[PDB]
Write a protein that binds this DNA or RNA. Structure first.
Lengths: 86, 49
RNA sequence: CUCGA
DNA sequence: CGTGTCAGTAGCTGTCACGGATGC
DNA sequence: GCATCCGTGAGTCGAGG
């Protein structure tokens, strides 16, 4: 029903309130730019929404999967486009 | 014990009186939410930092 | 960064 | 491309006079 | 109705880094 589609929105807002602020700090140390850490958080939680396997098991720490996705995003930024211009 | 240590001054009696929250596990979370905002406040996540 | 009037 | 046990800034206040919108 | 706090301003020119 319509409440089933709204339960998915209340599930994303739940993992926002438990992992977003901690994930922002982690990306903030790896980049040093706060505006870049916000971009990594939005992209990391967007991939969490696109992967129901990570949001399925609550008995398994989804926080660790987030730190790994954010880490891989940051090293990819650290390649060619940043290399010359930055 | 706070009144025992800072009792000789009236400016500290007015501090513990005008205080908002009381409790060892209460002011510890009060510090947590002002220091690291946006995070769930656990009695041991503030005891750690 | 440092110096000149 | 896939990602999955703790996994969490540096830096910093050693400026100040002054006016008026902002706020308990 | 007023204490708080925010935002504004703070010499000119020149040399080499």
């Amino acid at each position: 029903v319509s409440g089933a589609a709204a339960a998915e929105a209340a599930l994303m807002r739940a993992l926002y309130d438990e992992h977003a602020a901690v994930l922002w700090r982690y990306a903030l140390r790896l980049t040093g730019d706060a505006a870049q850490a916000e971009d990594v958080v939005q992209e990391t939680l967007l991939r969490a929404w696109q992967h129901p396997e990570v949001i399925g098991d609550t008995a398994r720490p989804a926080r660790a999967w987030l730190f790994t996705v954010a880490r891989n995003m940051i090293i990819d930024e650290r390649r060619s486009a940043r290399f010359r211009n930055v | 014990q706070i009144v025992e240590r800072f009792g000789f001054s009236e400016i500290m009696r007015s501090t513990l009186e005008k205080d908002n929250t009381v409790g060892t596990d209460e002011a510890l979370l009060d510090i947590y939410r002002k220091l690291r905002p946006g995070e769930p406040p656990t009695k041991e996540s503030a005891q750690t930092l």
